[PDB]
Ligand binder design. Structure first.
Ligand SMILES: COc1ccc2ccc(=O)oc2c1CC=C(C)C
Ligand SMILES: COc1ccc2ccc(=O)oc2c1CC=C(C)C
Ligand SMILES: OC[C@H]1O[C@](O)(CO)[C@@H](O)[C@@H]1O
Ligand SMILES: OC[C@H]1O[C@](O)(CO)[C@@H](O)[C@@H]1O
Lengths: 297, 297
């Protein structure tokens, strides 16, 4: 069953300026280039998933408008299905103002989340789970997403072992409400930002420190930028892959999303956790030498 | 003859994020609000001119596309005529990435001028000068704009004194090619940035220092932000108006454009240079207490 991979989360219009040096206050500078790029964690993962060759679908809140039309068009050009999008009656699809330093790949994100209602459990209740082999959830509205996770669980209990839906979750924002999401999913992604916010100084210590929160049987993954990525499963052994830096790092916008999608892809292809860590570091690393995601395969 | 006022220059899509504190490098912050706003020096002056009650027209290069459609729609909502726009066959209308500090009104502009061809003399040669009582030119492609200025001059020589077209020019960028524009126009606007670039420390010393470059009979104007604005005409007397700060300064984006348009409006209404300086400081000052230009009248 090579069904689709469903990613649930944010879609964002990223307005991107590429500069030599980060601008100072009240200054006026001319940019190297500018672009609009579809963004949002779950949305970027769909881009990378479809570039890796996997049929995938995005599910997130969008509002009808010019921004949405651009985003929907871009989704469809990547081959990312949007039939599960939760269209709202009023509002604006979120957007960000992004500055990318070209000399080191740093990225400044000024985000506008638009009081747009999040994907609700009632929205997710309508999804036909039989279309997906893997469902990835970007931690967002935790109380509602738990019910989605519970719905997937009840479905899985009634399926034969080979037709159970694999589940991954990302806890990327250091917000207390999201931490309960650690206890769901077969694969849990914890951000370096969340690890540090929680007092850890390395992926390894974060993995050892946090593993008692995950569902028994789950794999906890913590990427650490230039120091590579680490994972920890039920057998208690810490796994690690080094980073694979490109010659010049020019754009780290969405680099964590590339890692996440690559790990999801690798595991969904039957690879082992060690293999998935290495592939994730490789694809994310070479994204960092590119503007955007084209050229990552 | 209360004909139109024509402003020649840039139109820009300003993508604006309003923040508490200016973001640091590689950080991720959430904005207070975001908006798109039509921008560009000549374009912003048209906005303020139409808010002051004057029929006006914009002339600048635009490329057909979604950005242009937004800009044209916004022009027409302000009542700014766009029939003289120089549509190009290929390219993108310029846009900027703007961050506005809400606690002091500072503005960071990251601009993308799009290799879009500038309004040429051949474009301007087609304009029906009999429709305009005043023509303002944003210094840009100086060699071509001089020929426009020369065309207006030849027209004026053949008109009765009361039907001569008044001309103003802005020299806002510290670029050597633009300085020849000092010798044209009845009113010359020199920016604080250009004054400083040229070694001056105050409007007054800039006016005294630069006046020998202007056409005999012209008035030289130099605005200096919180220190108000100064002017110098042929009689040799230095005129000055203080600033009129709002209670809270929240948005200085386009504040010089508001001053320019207000001086043009005031002089075109027959007021004296002293009056035009005060009005310009008043309207620009109270723009600085507002986001955008609505509410400036
Ligand atoms: C945030 O993600 C980053 C950030 C900076 C770099 C720099 C070199 C590199 O090779 O990869 C980077 C990554 C992706 C690697 C991982 C493990 C996610
Ligand atoms: C650049 O323009 C600025 C910048 C900052 C302020 C702050 C207070 C104020 O009252 O006006 C300002 C202006 C406009 C005044 C002039 C003379 C152009
Ligand atoms: O927080 C949302 C921001 O983060 C990103 O998804 C990067 O992974 C950007 O595309 C978006 O602007
Ligand atoms: O340099 C162009 C920039 O300057 C402004 O015109 C401000 O006067 C902005 O509207 C535009 O982004």
């Amino acid at each position: 069953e090579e069904k689709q991979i469903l990613c649930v989360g944010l879609v964002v219009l990223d307005v991107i300026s590429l500069v030599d040096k980060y601008p100072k206050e009240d200054s006026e500078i001319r940019c190297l280039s500018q672009r609009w790029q579809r963004g949002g964690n779950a949305s970027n993962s769909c881009t990378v998933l479809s570039l890796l060759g996997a049929p995938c679908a995005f599910m997130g809140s969008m509002a009808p408008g010019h921004v949405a039309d651009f985003l929907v068009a871009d989704f469809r050009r990547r081959g990312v299905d949007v039939s599960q999008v939760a269209w709202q009656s009023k509002g604006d699809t979120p957007s960000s103002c992004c500055i990318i330093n070209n000399s080191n790949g740093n990225r400044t994100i000024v985000l506008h989340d638009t009081s747009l209602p999040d994907v609700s459990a009632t929205d997710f209740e309508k999804v036909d789970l039989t279309q997906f082999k893997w469902i990835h959830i970007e931690g967002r509205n935790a109380s509602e997403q738990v019910k989605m996770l519970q719905r997937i669980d009840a479905h899985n209990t009634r399926q034969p072992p080979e037709q159970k839906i694999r589940v991954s979750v990302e806890v990327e924002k250091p917000r207390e409400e999201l931490f309960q999401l650690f206890g769901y999913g077969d694969v849990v992604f914890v951000s370096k930002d969340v690890a540090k916010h929680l007092g850890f100084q390395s992926a390894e210590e974060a993995l050892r420190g946090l593993y008692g929160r995950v569902r028994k049987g789950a794999v906890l993954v913590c990427a650490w930028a230039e120091e590579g990525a680490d994972a920890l499963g039920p057998d208690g052994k810490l796994l690690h892959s080094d980073a694979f830096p490109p010659p010049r790092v020019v754009d780290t916008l969405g680099a964590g999303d590339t890692f996440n999608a690559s790990v999801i892809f690798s595991l969904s292809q039957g690879r082992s956790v060690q293999e998935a860590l290495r592939f994730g570091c490789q694809v994310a690393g070479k994204k960092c030498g590119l503007q955007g995601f084209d050229g990552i395969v």
